[PDB]
Design a protein around this nucleic acid. Structure first.
Ligand SMILES: Nc1nc2c(ncn2[C@@H]2O[C@H](COP(=O)(O)OP(=O)(O)NP(=O)(O)O)[C@@H](O)[C@H]2O)c(=O)[nH]1
Ligand SMILES: [Mg+2]
Lengths: 424, 218
RNA sequence: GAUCGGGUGUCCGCACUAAGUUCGGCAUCAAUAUGGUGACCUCCCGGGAGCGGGGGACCACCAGGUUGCCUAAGGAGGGGUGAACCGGCCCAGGUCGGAA
């Protein structure tokens, strides 16, 4: 154990250890991996009763059994010796308490280096099983509904319940809060403001639509082409789907239908929707690079790159797709996944994001930047495909397709999707 | 001439599994890497029904390409031992098989450091191979579970890799200083347990062609 | 800004590479501490037999605790046959010993 910090959940360092040698090295990266990213090996132990976190830094992962016994005795001596300072609601009990735990830890560390030489989980057991069987039947991935349920027996273990609460309604509630915060990815988006920033180098805005076969990449690409034209934007559809029959005439019917609603006469006199196509059988990274150089020269604010649908287990073809998105450097990689897929929503995005970073040759690789959740009008409340997607990926559901026309494109109501999923 | 061994291993692991912790996939990419380096360059060890020892001699080291063959033997036996460290948490006998792959990963890297001692290789790959040996000897004597023999070949690997940084440009020193910083966390743990007892080029000299000051001429 | 330098990537029965796509061949080490199994050899001791009590010797396989003058790699993996007499075991009937 080279490191040990104990702070509260309100972000207040109570006590820290870094050895007599220098001091206080890496207490912030310790907090980040251990509390920030969970809602030298850097692990943690949570006291959820009194809102404490016990972050430790060690090597030789095989000594994890004695490092866990040292966090358990330090956690038992800390919450007993300072039970008065940590049990009060006021943050002025911890600001005014004196946590001189250095001589108690040096004794628990030197003594654990000789061994090397309320709400329990039994109560919350039955309701975490009825909630896991409700998420799975409401189309949350089978294992996403298992980690979700265990994030809640952890969060409420030790904690006292309200004046009017049961075992059932507590794990049922903190599972809704751990589900809205994970369906709240660490990302945001914008509009014309974002193409003014793409004009800081005088270049268009290139979005890449990727995904598995039949989800709605081409049809929702046309709902977003109608949504960009509605905001006054000219969009050049790059037809890089050269692995199918009628993949260019599908996009040419979308360009004929969109250059009818938004013609040059009703736009100022200039072309606003135009298809860039090179036929079938051509390279999809060569038609895409020609359409970015063509939209720059012909003045198209947006390029919407349509790619062919593929599986998730194709080493010679997820190589060519991951190399396309790595090299083309698109502004927003939009994974298109249907709201009808079940447990495959996890395997699609994990292999789609693992490919984009493997066959990438950068330091920080270009990963999927969002999700388009299509066929939303087909599940009717079996909505757990939105949770399975923003769970594994910490990327937002940029659009939610709700039909086949251009007007069936919605923003995500992520609050009522967890309220429908956590109500059983 | 040159070989960036550290850049070779780091971008082959992040691309073939080790970003998500797949040592079984990284070793299989290492074995297919070596088979296809052997089938292309016609450097097969055995023929059908017989085996002959592969000896990478000094004459074939001009290619700047056969050092990657022995390195893919060092990275294959290293990747197998790290996978056997995850399977030894539930099968503690797997540790005996782990330590037999790490003694032959330093032996390939000690035979690959002796090959780089040739005069046909620059002053960059002799020393990337010298201290890739001293890094695998500090990880084997760290898995010996002796904390003292672990900081002896880690402070040796740190002092070698730092002697290589100071000798060249601070831009090429970045690779050798990235590897002293790469093995520096392991040195703080063994010191805690000893004392326990054509590119685009612009012709910017055409913008310098201008008139002399014509104030004295009026 | 007329011709146009100066230079590339589309066209090839092409040149060399070697993340994958696919089916085969060959091949796959050894020593220790502990216990176990199966056989076999050689002594005592009791009995009217089938048998019962005990002392050693040797062989193979086996479990799992340390290991190597061990590998190009050598798991203490998973299975199946174990029969027309040759693994062990539980062995109906039958059968041999017995008054039983
Ligand atoms: N009901 C409904 N249907 C949708 C939605 N999004 C797409 N679809 C339908 O799903 C079908 C698939 O269309 P398409 O756009 O070609 O999907 P794709 O992913 O491009 N297929 P490919 O792999 O061949 O490129 C179409 O019939 C389309 O209308 C949606 O939100 N709701
Ligand atoms: Mg398509």
């Amino acid at each position: 154990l080279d490191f040990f910090t104990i702070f509260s959940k309100g972000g207040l360092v109570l006590w820290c250890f870094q050895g007599v040698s220098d001091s206080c090295t890496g207490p912030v990266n310790a907090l980040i991996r251990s509390v920030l990213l969970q809602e030298l090996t850097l692990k943690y132990k949570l006291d959820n009763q009194f809102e404490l976190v016990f972050v430790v830094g060690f090597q030789k992962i095989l000594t994890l059994t004695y490092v866990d016994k040292l966090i358990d005795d330090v956690h038992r001596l800390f919450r007993d010796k300072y039970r008065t300072e940590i049990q009060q609601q006021s943050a002025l009990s911890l600001l005014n308490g004196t946590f001189d735990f250095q001589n108690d830890f040096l004794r628990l560390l030197r003594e654990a280096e000789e061994s090397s030489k309320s709400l329990s989980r039994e109560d919350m057991e039955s309701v975490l099983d009825k909630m896991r069987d409700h998420l799975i039947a409401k189309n949350v991935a089978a294992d996403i509904a298992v980690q979700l349920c265990e994030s809640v027996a952890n969060k409420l273990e030790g904690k006292v319940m309200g004046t009017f609460s049961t075992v059932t309604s507590t794990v049922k509630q903190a599972l809704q809060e751990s589900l809205v915060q994970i369906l709240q990815p660490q990302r945001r988006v914008d509009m014309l403001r974002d193409i003014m920033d793409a004009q800081r180098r005088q270049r268009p805005y290139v979005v890449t639509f990727c995904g598995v076969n039949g989800v709605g990449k081409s049809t929702n690409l046309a709902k977003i082409s109608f949504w960009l034209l509605e905001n006054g934007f000219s969009v050049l559809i790059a037809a890089c789907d050269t692995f199918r029959a009628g993949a260019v005439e599908q996009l040419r019917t979308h360009t004929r239908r969109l250059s009818a609603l938004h013609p040059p006469e009703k736009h100022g006199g200039r072309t606003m929707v135009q298809l860039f196509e090179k036929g079938y059988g051509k390279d999809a990274a060569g038609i895409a690079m020609e359409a970015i150089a063509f939209a720059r020269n012909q003045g198209f604010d947006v390029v919407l790159v349509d790619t062919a649908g593929r599986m998730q287990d194709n080493a010679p073809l997820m190589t060519a797709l991951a190399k396309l998105i790595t090299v083309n450097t698109p502004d927003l990689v939009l994974f298109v996944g249907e709201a009808l897929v079940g447990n495959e929503a996890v395997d699609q995005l994990v292999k789609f994001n693992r490919a984009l970073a493997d066959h990438s040759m950068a330091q920080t690789p270009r990963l999927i930047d969002g999700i388009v959740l299509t066929k939303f009008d087909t599940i009717d409340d079996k909505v757990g495909a939105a949770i399975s997607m923003t769970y594994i990926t910490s990327k937002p559901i940029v659009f939610v397709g709700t039909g086949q026309t251009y007007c069936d494109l919605r923003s995500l109501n992520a609050k009522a999707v967890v309220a429908a999923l956590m109500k059983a | 001439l040159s070989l960036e061994i550290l850049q070779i291993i780091k971008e082959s692991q992040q691309q073939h599994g080790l970003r998500h912790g797949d040592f079984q996939r990284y070793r299989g990419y290492c074995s297919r890497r070596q088979r296809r380096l052997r089938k292309t360059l016609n450097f097969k060890m055995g023929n059908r029904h017989k085996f002959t020892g592969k000896k990478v001699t000094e004459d074939l080291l001009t290619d700047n390409r056969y050092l990657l063959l022995v390195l893919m033997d060092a990275e294959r036996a290293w990747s197998y031992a790290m996978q056997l460290k995850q399977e030894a948490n539930t099968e503690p006998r797997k540790r005996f098989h782990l330590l037999s792959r790490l003694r032959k990963a330093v032996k390939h890297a000690e035979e690959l450091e002796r090959l780089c001692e040739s005069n046909r290789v620059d002053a960059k790959t002799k020393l990337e191979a010298q201290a890739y040996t001293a890094y695998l000897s500090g990880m084997l004597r760290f898995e010996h579970q002796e904390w003292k023999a672990a900081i002896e070949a880690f402070n040796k690997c740190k002092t070698i890799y730092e002697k290589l940084a100071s000798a060249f440009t601070e831009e090429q020193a970045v690779l050798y200083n990235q590897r002293v910083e790469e093995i520096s966390p392991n040195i703080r743990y063994c010191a805690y347990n000893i004392g326990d007892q054509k590119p685009l080029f612009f012709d910017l000299a055409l913008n310098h062609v201008a008139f002399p000051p014509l104030e004295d001429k009026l």
